[PDB]
Ligand SMILES: CC(=O)N[C@@H]1[C@@H](OC(C)=O)[C@H](OC(C)=O)[C@@H](COC(C)=O)O[C@H]1NC(=S)N/C=C/N([C@@H](C(=O)O)C(C)C)S(=O)(=O)c1ccc(-c2ccccc2)cc1
């Protein structure tokens with residue numbers, strides 16, 4: 415699929431979830447981007463004005479992208495592939511309970527995952543891969559991209 419044709423990519427939080435406080439949201443997202451720039455020559459920059467490559471949104475139900483969320487459970491989030499406009503944007507189902515750790519849907523892991531799609535990643539068949547299609551809470555202390563995650567992302571960006 416198309417990949418971002420630039421290594422300097424900006425993102426912007428459009429709106430905040432009420433489940434976590436702001437600094438926890440900011441932290442999760444930022445950390446989430448760091449997971450991917452840690453193993454690539456990509457470099458992420460949060461902006462607070464103007465238009466970003468990747469727009470992080472919290473929303474419930476139908477939110478204007480023709481892919482409605484489904485309330486609590488089922489679909490947690492989706493993200494659009496690299497592109498202009500909605501391209502690369504990552505949306506989070508506000509009807510999930512977003513958390514810094516467990517007792518909800520962990521924002522950090524979920525954003526590491528969506529961000530991966532936002533960069534043009536597919537899914538993996540390794541259950542230890544962050545791009546694995548099934549969500550499960552894993553230990554963030556021992557969090558690590560799998561080989562499969564590393565091979566895929568560096569095949570798009572080096
Ligand atoms: C793409 C594919 O192979 N599978 C189908 C589509 O079939 C096609 C291409 O036509 C199907 O077709 C279309 C375009 O309509 C598509 C649409 O169906 C709906 C209602 O989503 O869904 C695919 N099925 C998949 S992949 N399952 C959903 C997945 N989640 C999303 C995701 O992967 O990011 C995804 C919606 C973008 S998820 O919400 O359940 C999810 C969110 C987050 C983690 C997660 C995981 C790990 C860690 C943290 C977090 C997991 C899963």
Ligand SMILES: [Ca+2]
Nearest residue numbers: 485487489507
């Ligand atoms: Ca949902």
Ligand SMILES: [Ca+2]
Nearest residue numbers: 467499500501
């Ligand atoms: Ca975009």
Ligand SMILES: [Ca+2]
Nearest residue numbers: 433508510511
């Ligand atoms: Ca919520």
Ligand SMILES: [Zn+2]
Nearest residue numbers: 477479481505
């Ligand atoms: Zn959406």
Ligand SMILES: [Zn+2]
Nearest residue numbers: 527531537547
């Ligand atoms: Zn996915």
